[PDB]
Amino acid sequence: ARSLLPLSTSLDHRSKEELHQDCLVLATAKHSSADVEERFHLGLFTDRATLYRMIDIEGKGHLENGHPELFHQLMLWKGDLKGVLQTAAERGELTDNLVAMAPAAGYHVWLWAVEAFAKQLCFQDQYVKAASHLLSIHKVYEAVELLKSNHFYREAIAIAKARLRPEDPVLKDLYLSWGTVLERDGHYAVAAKCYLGATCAYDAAKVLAKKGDAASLRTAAELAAIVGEDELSASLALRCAQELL
Amino acid sequence: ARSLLPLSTSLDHRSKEELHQDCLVLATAKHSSADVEERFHLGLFTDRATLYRMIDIEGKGHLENGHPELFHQLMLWKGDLKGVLQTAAERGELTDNLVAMAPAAGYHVWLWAVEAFAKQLCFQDQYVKAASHLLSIHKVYEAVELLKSNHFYREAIAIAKARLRPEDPVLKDLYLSWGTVLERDGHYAVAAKCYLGATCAYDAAKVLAKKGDAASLRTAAELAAIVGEDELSASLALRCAQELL
Ligand SMILES: [K+]
User: Fold this and answer.
1) B45, B23, B191, B144: which is closest to A221 by C-alpha?
2) What is the C-alpha separation between A19 and A16, in angstroms, rounded?
3) CA A187 – CA A180 distance, rounded (Å)
4) So where are chain A's domains?
5) Residue of chain B minimizing CA distance to A42
6) How remote is the CA of residue B52 from the centroid of ligand 1, in Å?
7) Is residue B35 classed exposed, middle or buried when 0-12, 13-18 and 19+ CB atoms within 10 A define those classes?
8) Where are the alpha helices (DSSP H) in chain A?
9) Phosphoserine-modified residues are where (chains A, B)?
């Protein structure tokens, strides 16, 4: 895998003349500074404050190399996990890997990181993944609403039907809202399945009939009969016959 | 962004003769068996049991196609993710995404998932990433020892120096261990840097003198002088003059 300390490693692989200079500077420093500042790679052998200087230089290098994930992975070593998550979020660089580490700072920090990751995924055109993350933090209704408002009706219903009681109004509204849109666009057969899902079978027969063809009228008539809307069934059946003349 | 329910989506986009049969089967099923079983795509519109059958089928399709991350989301939707985490650990198929969602099953399930994930990452020879996840559950000594025992001395030292007190014996052993290996391999100048890190300047001078050339003997003598080991410095400085004859 890729090294998290490439600049300092490269500095440590220089000529013996540079290594000899390093030993002297290092011996001087450990024996109770501009030399040390120049030779930042000595942070590995000096003190924590010079180590952190070295790490910050390597982190800057990872950003200038288009590798923000290594920057964040490296800053985790220094310990400010919340600070790492804050700047990762501000930069739109949250990842599953960083969210997976968020519970080290407490449940509350993970909650915030999951929600921030979900916002970021919406901006990255990954609504379904974002909804799944909202589910992980028990925000079932928010996940459903996110998918509904972005026209992922299929997935919203699946989640809603999996987690809510069958009679929950949110579930019924998903069926109706999807059916409505389908009807407007002319997908009458699919809209009818939707209204059936919402336990509005009368409207389901009607919408199938809006197509106007004989096949749709027949099935609409037979649908009404199954449900006990015999009067509607008779009228649709008569319309079916009229279309075949 | 692959769709999570492609098989049932395809079934829902067949000929409208097929969708008309869908409507009749669906109307019958909600107004209350073989058609119910055959047309599993109706699970989105029927009841939870049929929905779960449908989701299981879709997940099976994801696993065979090589998209287990889509199967993981479907299982989440089901709410058995916690069971699916146990199966992933047994098979060593955990992912960053699964750990990021694990706290949904409880804080200690995440703790267990991180430990299983780090164990898996070691088998996949991703030792530095494994150490990062051990840090996330505050197992610093374990992370440092893992890196050391797999010869990631540089990373081991950086993490230990960042998290442990300067006088922690673990940090000293790291320098001495790395220096020991470097010396055995003939990298005397690097080993001397490690011995300086462990506050063993006397041994640093000596090891740097093992190279034998005038430059190494010289810098070693100057190193002993900087530390106040002037007796050693004189000995090495005169060995340097003998070499320059
Ligand atoms: K909890």
Assistant:
1) B23
2) 5
3) 10
4) 1-78
5) B193
6) 27
7) middle
8) 6-12, 16-30, 34-38, 48-64, 68-75, 81-90, 96-101, 107-123, 127-136, 140-149, 153-163, 169-185, 188-197, 201-209, 214-227, 230-244
9) 3
